[PDB]
Structure 1
Amino acid sequence: KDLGIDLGTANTLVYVKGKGIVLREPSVVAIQRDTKQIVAVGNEAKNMIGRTPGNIVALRPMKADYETTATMMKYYIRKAIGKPYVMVCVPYGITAVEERAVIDATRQAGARDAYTIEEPFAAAIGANLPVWEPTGSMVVDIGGGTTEVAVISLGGIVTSQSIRIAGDEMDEAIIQYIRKSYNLMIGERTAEAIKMEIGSAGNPEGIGNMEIRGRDLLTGLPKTIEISAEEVAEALRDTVYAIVESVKNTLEKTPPELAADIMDRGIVLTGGGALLRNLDKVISQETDMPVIVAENPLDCVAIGTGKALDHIDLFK
């Protein structure tokens, strides 16, 4: 059996050729404070912390100990399943020493051999763009920690860019806007809920208002206020600008013929971050190019990592 593993910032997905996305579990680990050892991974850690055994702490490795990686991979590989060949999705900006570290750890986790794929190429394969044709295609993968842009043609990446401004950074910007605007400190969970509920990249008209709670910075005491979609859009302006610039910087680095094909096919957005309302419209208006959101934007990467198992030669 061959496995494709997308160990995301918050969510891990395992794909087994044949069965498809067999596993969906949080990118979470549970570590004994005293033994300083990984006691559980994924749902097992969730259950552990959920049973509250004490002396356990829960951590998300996010963006890296070779041991944490190898242990995590050991759990997801065994739970999903004579040893497997594993395609591991990696961010675009990954160095070669890091990429070798992922392979050794995956090999230590129980893989015959391991191969890596850049998230943008996987996202493109999962979103059914014609990656193998000599036509140019563009994918924008906006996750939690990273936004990654790439142009693909003939089973390779022509040009690509990565930025650390993405879904998490949208939440931060909301938190910072409310800190400055209302002298109120909200947490991550509330910031995420605001982005999901009333967040938008632009045209916040009709999105609505939300009551939120946080810590007043003068008094230290909890406080409830009303936040508008208009304000949240402003709070996300610069974050959205940054994403638009990387798309434009990638086009400026694209050959004309491929740049001309993308103007016809359009740009595909993948990743949970791409669910920010009207981001597709904003990027389209600023690029003068069709922009669409992929059909299954949260599973594209994992599906692409799974389908990449059929051309394992290329990644070998």
Structure 2
Amino acid sequence: LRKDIGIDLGTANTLVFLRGKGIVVNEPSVIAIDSTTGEILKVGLEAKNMIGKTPATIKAIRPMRDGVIADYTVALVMLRYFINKAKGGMNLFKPRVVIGVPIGITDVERRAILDAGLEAGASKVFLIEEPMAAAIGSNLNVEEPSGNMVVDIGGGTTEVAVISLGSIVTWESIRIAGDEMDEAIVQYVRETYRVAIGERTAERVKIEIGNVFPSKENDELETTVSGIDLSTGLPRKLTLKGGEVREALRSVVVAIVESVRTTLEKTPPELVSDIIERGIFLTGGGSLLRGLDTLLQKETGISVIRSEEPLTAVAKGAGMVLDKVNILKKLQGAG
């Protein structure tokens, strides 16, 4: 009805794009329920917060387990939360909603999200694979017959898609992408110093000094983090150097590369020639690893482009799309 919104449901942060406004929502994909009753207490940023104040009286539920929807009732609720913060409050119409889905998804998993959305408050809902949305959000012309290649690394899944004629022709999805990065940092810290760190700290180490390419510059990035010594139960404090960390991260990322390479191979040659000319479009919150662009290049030989807006591209696309009737009329519908 009145306002149009695109949602990028992620396993990290959910982003909501409002048409006429922009990204009107960037809050963590989390609900906090009381550890006893199962009383949904807060959703979103309000929940990231009270989970750090009072973690001992709370169960944290993250509705998108892997790529799709696991706890449909919790989803429903999360969904209802974001469409509402996005809607405005002073708005009282059911909005039109285009949600980003992963590529490899069963119609059953598809039917679900359509329903959830419809219950959450949408007057009408569309789906769109995360990469087509990204391509549209950056203004690549997906209607054009020239090959395009997007690599969307999130936190849950890395997706590699060849777009050509408002369609996807080849793709690969794999379950390694950014949480597996954070995870490798935690493990490294555990096994080299005997120290235990956790999600939010892993994530900050990754941001401040994470990298997958050698260089005087990357090796002198340092940071200090705090954890618990697994031997003394006491709080320790380490200083990590970008250079100890690279070893671990490379192992994880090799598999994302392999996924890209594996894609190029089963791509129709005519499009490969366009992709070798234009480059690979590297997008997504998972992608912001120092040297990832450089490493991909070295390892596939095509140049790599970074999105100027790595975190908001899919959402902007999910909303951009409600004008594009020619690409709209092709999306699965409900409402």
* Counterpart amino acid of residue 102 in structure 1: I
Cα separation, 1, equivalents of 2:248 and 2:52? 35
- In structure 2, relative to structure 1, the CA distance for the partners of 1:182 and 1:47 (3 Å cut) is closer
- The match for 1:279 among 292, 313, 327 is 292
Counterpart residue number, 1:314? 330
Counterpart residue number, 2:90? none
- Pair 1:123 & 2:139 matched: no
Cα separation, 1, equivalents of 2:287 and 2:278? 18
SS in 2 for 1:314: coil
- Pair 1:6 & 2:43 matched: no
Counterpart residue number, 1:304? 317
Cα separation, 2, equivalents of 1:46 and 1:181? 29
- The match for 2:165 among 154, 157, 160 is 154
- Pair 1:108 & 2:131 matched: no
- The match for 1:26 among 13, 25, 28 is 28
Counterpart residue number, 2:44? 42
Cα separation, 2, equivalents of 1:45 and 1:303? 25
- CA RMSD of the aligned region, Å? 2.2
- Pair 1:76 & 2:87 matched: no
- In structure 2, relative to structure 1, the CA distance for the partners of 1:291 and 1:147 (3 Å cut) is same
- The match for 2:224 among 206, 211, 232 is 211
Question: What's the TM-score once normalised by structure 1's chain length?
Answer: 0.92
- Pair 1:248 & 2:254 matched: no
8 Å contact from structure 1 (residues 139, 151) kept in 2: yes
8 Å contact from structure 1 (residues 204, 229) kept in 2: no
1:44 shift after superposition: 4.6
Q: Structure 2 unaligned runs (5+)?
A: 88-92
Question: What's the TM-score once normalised by structure 2's chain length?
Answer: 0.87
1:268 shift after superposition: 0.9
- Pair 1:291 & 2:304 matched: yes
8 Å contact from structure 1 (residues 205, 229) kept in 2: no
1:182 shift after superposition: 2.5
Of 113-122 and 135-144, deviating more is 113-122
Cα separation, 2, equivalents of 1:51 and 1:213? 17
- The match for 1:15 among 17, 25, 28 is 17
- In structure 2, relative to structure 1, the CA distance for the partners of 1:75 and 1:185 (3 Å cut) is closer
Counterpart residue number, 1:86? 97
Give the length in aligned residue pairs: 316
8 Å contact from structure 1 (residues 10, 62) kept in 2: no
- In structure 2, relative to structure 1, the CA distance for the partners of 1:23 and 1:213 (3 Å cut) is closer
Cα separation, 2, equivalents of 1:309 and 1:90? 16
8 Å contact from structure 2 (residues 63, 72) kept in 1: no
8 Å contact from structure 2 (residues 151, 280) kept in 1: yes
8 Å contact from structure 2 (residues 154, 178) kept in 1: yes
- In structure 2, relative to structure 1, the CA distance for the partners of 1:213 and 1:112 (3 Å cut) is closer
- The match for 2:273 among 232, 237, 260 is 260
8 Å contact from structure 1 (residues 17, 309) kept in 2: no
* Counterpart amino acid of residue 279 in structure 1: L
1:157 shift after superposition: 0.9
Of 254-263 and 77-86, deviating more is 77-86
Query: Cα deviation per residue 1:255-290 (whole Å; 9 max; x = unaligned)?
Result: 101111000010111112211001001001111101
* Counterpart amino acid of residue 220 in structure 1: G
